[PDB]
């Protein structure tokens, strides 16, 4: 069959011969970032990062090659009722308006797993590390945190909540009025969640070894990245409730509204064919076939099938304004499309600094958001601030806000 | 006798199904 020329990640694209080829490349890149159930024994694994979707659905429009990728068994995405409309301006320039009521009902909700590990490694007869709950009167250098979440073994228990300045593993190293130093493990800053599983074992070296899995539920929000299977990625721009969403005559509000302007320059016509075929599939009860090179499926046959179900044959519907109730003058293309929630969330990316840690050598702010570092005001930014003539802003960026010294 | 053009689209996916039934997807490794 000629559709065996595609690999694993391009075999999930419905109608890839109707797409411009860079968009197939982008979906092959972004199907690997899609959130689903990555493996069925995810409750046993202490992976450092894990992303499990609450309600993965298999696609309504499928290729025949996804029976062998096991995508029907471990799917990564949800069939979303997707209107292609300009609504209130919040889906412009590759954005998505989402239904807040759908998101409240579990639409694209997911759980994030972070795993932390510590070895209770004795290094000689001088420096001994112990899993124990530190106390102020005994341990030096405790980080002014909440230390009573820990149990008697120095390890936190499943079910406890933790914020970014909480300790989960209490580790003290004996010090050669303070017998030992605190070398405990805290969560990542600006993180939160429930302790999900604490596993205690011993490694090859025979030392006590813990892995603690912390779970946090990530509800979709503004700035979370969603993509279809046609390279049509975009952050959530706003979330409207069901009574603000546009609706059909039978009360169907779209889960997602994407911009019309995402289509013409990209020519993802397979996206529109997948919406049409998904409308036909959801009304018929079939799962549509979107195997690439098929003469049994063209747009006219899908249209005739759709018009057999009391719909417009081209998949448009008369939507009503959610705010005013008035009919929208244009008829809106709306139908079920498989969206993926990508691992690029905004709460994993938001970072600000005011003043904090500085590098030991050059006394400039640290590197990266994981250590409360600053952003590099680089050479091109310096060049642009030169072109502005803003000499004092350039001076405070490159002298006062990084490393003032005398 | 032979596979007619109407049975071909199911014959080819039967043989692809048999291929992936034995070989799987990480057979090279």
């Amino acid at each position: 069959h000629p559709s065996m020329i595609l690999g694993v990640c391009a075999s999930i694209i419905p109608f890839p011969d109707h797409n411009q080829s860079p968009r197939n490349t982008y979906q092959s890149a972004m199907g690997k970032q899609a959130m689903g159930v990555y493996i069925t024994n995810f409750h046993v694994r202490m992976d450092t990062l894990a992303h499990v979707l609450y309600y993965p659905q298999k696609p309504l429009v499928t290729t025949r090659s996804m029976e062998y990728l096991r995508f029907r068994e471990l799917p990564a995405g949800i069939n979303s009722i997707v209107a292609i409309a300009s609504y209130t301006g919040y889906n412009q320039e590759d954005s998505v308006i989402m239904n807040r009521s759908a998101v409240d009902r579990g639409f694209f909700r997911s759980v994030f797993y972070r795993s932390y590990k510590e070895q209770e490694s004795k290094k000689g007869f001088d420096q001994e590390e112990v899993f124990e709950k530190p106390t102020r009167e005994t341990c030096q250098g405790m980080r002014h945190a909440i230390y009573d979440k820990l149990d008697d073994d120095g390890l936190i228990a499943p079910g406890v909540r933790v914020s970014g300045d909480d300790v989960i593993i209490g580790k003290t190293v004996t010090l050669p009025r303070y017998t030992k130093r605190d070398c405990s493990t805290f969560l990542r800053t600006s993180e939160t969640g429930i302790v999900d599983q604490v596993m205690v074992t011993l490694n090859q070296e025979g030392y006590k070894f813990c892995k603690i899995r912390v779970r946090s539920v990530r509800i979709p929000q503004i700035g979370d990245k969603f993509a279809s299977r046609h390279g049509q990625k975009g952050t959530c721009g706003i979330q409207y409730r069901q009574e603000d969403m546009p609706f059909t005559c039978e009360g169907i509000t779209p889960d997602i509204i994407i911009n019309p302007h995402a289509i013409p320059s990209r020519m993802t016509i397979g996206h529109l064919i997948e919406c049409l075929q998904g409308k036909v599939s959801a009304n018929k009860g079939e799962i549509g076939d979107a195997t690439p090179f098929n003469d049994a499926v063209n747009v006219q046959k899908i249209s005739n099938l759709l018009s057999d179900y009391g719909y417009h044959l081209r998949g448009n519907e008369v939507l009503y304004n959610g705010f005013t109730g008035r009919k929208i003058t244009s008829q809106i293309f709306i139908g079920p499309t498989y969206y993926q929630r990508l691992k690029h969330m905004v709460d994993d990316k938001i970072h600000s600094r005011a003043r904090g840690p500085i590098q030991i050598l050059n006394r400039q702010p640290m590197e990266g958001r994981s250590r409360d570092g600053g952003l590099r005001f680089g050479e091109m930014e310096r060049d642009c601030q030169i072109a502005h003539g803003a000499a004092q802003f350039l001076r405070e960026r490159l002298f006062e806000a990084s490393d003032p010294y005398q | 006798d032979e596979i007619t053009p109407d049975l071909w689209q199911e014959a080819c996916w039967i043989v692809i199904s048999s291929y992936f039934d034995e070989k799987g997807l990480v057979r090279q490794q």
Partner: protein, 66 residues
């Protein structure tokens, strides 16, 4: 993993219809006729049952911790 309680779009209850849907599927109903017998008229609720992957059946194959 398990069937959603409500349809995401409209909020119709579909969490009580999964085992009935599977019973109808075992009774040689076509999927569209099974969805019609369950009273799922809007295509938003039909894609809840039509596209559901019952992964909790796979997660029940592992012995519990306690």
């Amino acid at each position: 993993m398990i069937i959603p309680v409500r349809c995401f779009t409209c909020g119709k209850i579909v969490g009580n219809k999964w085992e009935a849907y599977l019973g109808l599927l075992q009774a040689e109903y076509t999927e569209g006729d099974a969805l019609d017998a369950l009273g799922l008229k809007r295509y938003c609720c039909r894609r809840m049952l039509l596209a559901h992957v019952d992964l909790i059946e796979k997660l029940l194959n592992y012995a519990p911790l306690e």
